Ligand binder design. Sequence first.
Ligand SMILES: COc1ccc(Br)cc1-n1cc(NS(=O)(=O)c2ccccc2OC)nn1
Ligand SMILES: [Cl-]
Ligand SMILES: [Cl-]
Ligand SMILES: [Cl-]
Ligand SMILES: [Cl-]
Ligand SMILES: [Cl-]
Ligand SMILES: [Cl-]
Ligand SMILES: [Cl-]
Ligand SMILES: [Zn+2]
Length: 273
Amino acid sequence: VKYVDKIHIGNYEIDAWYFSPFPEDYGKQPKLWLCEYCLKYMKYEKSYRFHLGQCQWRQPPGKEIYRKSNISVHEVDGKDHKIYCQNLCLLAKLFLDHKTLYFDVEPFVFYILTEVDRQGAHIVGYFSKEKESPDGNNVSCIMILPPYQRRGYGRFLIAFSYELSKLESTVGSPEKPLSDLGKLSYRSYWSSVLLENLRDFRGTLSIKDLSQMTSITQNDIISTLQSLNMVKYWKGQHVICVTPKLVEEHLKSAQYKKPPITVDSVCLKWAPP
Ligand SMILES: COc1ccc(Br)cc1-n1cc(NS(=O)(=O)c2ccccc2OC)nn1
Ligand SMILES: [Cl-]
Ligand SMILES: [Cl-]
Ligand SMILES: [Cl-]
Ligand SMILES: [Cl-]
Ligand SMILES: [Cl-]
Ligand SMILES: [Cl-]
Ligand SMILES: [Cl-]
Ligand SMILES: [Zn+2]
């Protein structure tokens, strides 16, 4: 059984990282061809070119809940746009080892990140979120397509997931296990948020305060502070321990970069459930 090993999407040809359970006949051709707008998968260059002349979509379905300059997020309910969401999950599984759901998409909402030009809104990546998470996960799966990786889009989508959690007045954590890139992306985000907050705030913040302010879990704050040498243990409790000196050193170092893209609360049009 030959697996899908290469996709064509828009102007990109991208090699697979992992098995994805596209129907067996789809793996048999040299490439799988995806409409970059509706995510229809096609077996042939000729069916793909036909489709691109006929397909009217120039953006994701659902509602554009965020737009600032040419960066857009669409919110897509798995129940309302099932085929689109299944197509997105099969695409995602080519680049995610640990994603296990592709067809049963109704329980999830999908947040699609696009970069816009005069042709259309071009998919960069997404995250999925359970409508009802028994564990308080604010992200189920998160993926950036290879050509956009390590360019700030992952940090943006993580920031976006916590902006939703903050509007819901809840803490959340990504569902584990995380991708290798995901682990790096999350520690970098958490490090950046915690240091920026400790800098900007006049006076002392606790771990519980930082959790309420950021919607990061106390556990994720603790592991991040451990990585920054900014926490002590005292009679069975983690206690924040930092000087504005050490915060400034971290912010002024090569280990911290200003976010390329930030989430502007003003550009987010979203009411919590
Ligand atoms: C949640 O991130 C992912 C989850 C799954 C998969 Br597959 C990819 C990603 N991801 C993230 C990033 N981009 S970034 O902006 O976070 C970033 C910027 C600078 C340096 C390193 C970075 O990331 C390591 N690109 N891929
Ligand atoms: Cl590639
Ligand atoms: Cl292939
Ligand atoms: Cl459209
Ligand atoms: Cl999954
Ligand atoms: Cl499934
Ligand atoms: Cl990875
Ligand atoms: Cl918590
Ligand atoms: Zn299409």
